[PDB]
């Protein structure tokens, strides 16, 4: 599977039939239809002891993986019951500034989307958690192009070390608090992983406020390669799944 004409999102259902399920992600967020829920709690983002390990080019995007063997970087509150541990973040992005996000807002696409992936500690490990309807919480943050994001620059700086598929580099002491916008106002809905295996395990928490990154920062994302070293060069762009049908779901708003 991938993002091309012959293996992209329209093909995924042939290997991952859940691709046509009842709670697939991403979705369009229709701002006028989202339901304000005053009983929704503020988000609690506790990233003060985060332990980043490494950065990997996985062939589809790049991951930054964290030590999730203790409560070091956790998401609580909002729509969540219990404690979700940060395992990784990654991005989805476009070939052009007018596309690249997975979620849309009134059908508007952003240049990119950051996913901070967390799992519910009551299930013991990430592999157990992805098999549960409340196993994961993914915090989604839109990227627009404008001013640089200083907290992203260390990520941009190391991408030359992981240009091709399967390359990894040490990436310790990275502070993911540098990727957050000012407001933690959010939308929330039940959905899925947006790549195979497309499991329906995710509570999506999508922040209202985008972050802005510079032209130079997003251009460095687009110089990554899908291919392995010595295979035909294919730029790593447009690694996003389009909006899926909302079906029997209500998007709730904290605001
Ligand atoms: Zn993602």
From Swiss-Prot:
Disulfide bonds: none annotated. Changing residue 58 to H: Reduced proton transfer. Coiled coil: none annotated. The modification Phosphoserine is found at residues 161, 168. It holds the Pfam family Carb_anhydrase. Changing residue 195 to S: Enhanced p-nitrophenyl acetate esterase activity, but normal CO(2) hydrase activity. The record marks 3, 58, 63 as: Fine-tunes the proton-transfer properties of H-64. Activated by X-ray, histamine, L-adrenaline, L- and D-phenylalanine, L- and D-histidine, L-His-OMe and beta-Ala-His (carnosine). Its EC number is 4.2.1.1, 4.2.1.69. Changing residue 60 to G: Impaired activity, not rescued by 4-methylimidazole (4-MI). It is found in: Cytoplasm; Cell membrane. It comes from the Eukaryota. CDD domains: alpha_CA_I_II_III_XIII. Zn(2+) binds at residues 90, 92, 115. Changing residue 138 to F/Y: Strongly impaired activity. Zinc. Can also use cobalt(II) with lower efficiency, but not copper(II), nickel(II) and manganese(II). Changing residue 194 to S/V: Reduced activity. It catalyses: hydrogencarbonate + H(+) = CO2 + H2O; urea = cyanamide + H2O. Belongs to the alpha-carbonic anhydrase family. Interacts with SLC4A4. Interaction with SLC4A7 regulates SLC4A7 transporter activity. Interacts with SLC26A6 isoform 4 (via C-terminus cytoplasmic domain). This is Carbonic anhydrase 2.
């Amino acid at each position: 599977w991938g993002y091309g004409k012959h293996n992209g999102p329209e093909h995924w259902h042939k290997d991952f039939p859940i691709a046509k399920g009842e709670r697939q992600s991403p979705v369009d967020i229709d701002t006028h239809t989202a339901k304000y829920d005053p009983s929704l709690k503020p988000l609690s983002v506790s990233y003060d002891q985060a332990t980043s390990l490494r950065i990997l080019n996985n062939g589809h995007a790049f991951n930054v993986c964290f030590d999730d063997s203790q409560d070091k970087a956790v998401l609580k509150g909002g729509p969540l019951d219990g404690t979700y541990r940060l395992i990784q973040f990654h991005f989805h992005w476009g070939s052009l500034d007018g596309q690249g996000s997975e979620h849309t807002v009134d059908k508007k696409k952003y240049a990119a989307e950051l996913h901070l992936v967390h799992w519910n500690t009551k299930y013991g490990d990430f592999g157990k958690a992805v098999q549960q309807p409340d196993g994961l919480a993914v915090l989604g943050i839109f990227l627009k192009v404008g001013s640089a994001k200083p907290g992203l620059q260390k990520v941009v700086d190391v991408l030359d070390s992981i240009k091709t598929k399967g390359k990894s580099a040490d990436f310790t002491n990275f502070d993911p608090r540098g990727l957050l916008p000012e407001s933690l106002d959010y939308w929330t809905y039940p959905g899925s992983l947006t790549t195979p295996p497309l499991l329906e395990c995710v509570t999506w928490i999508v922040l209202k406020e985008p972050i802005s990154v510079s032209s130079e920062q997003v251009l460095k994302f687009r110089k990554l390669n899908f291919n392995g070293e010595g295979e035909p060069e294919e730029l790593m762009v447009d690694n996003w799944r389009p909006a899926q049908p909302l079906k029997n779901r209500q998007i709730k708003a904290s605001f």
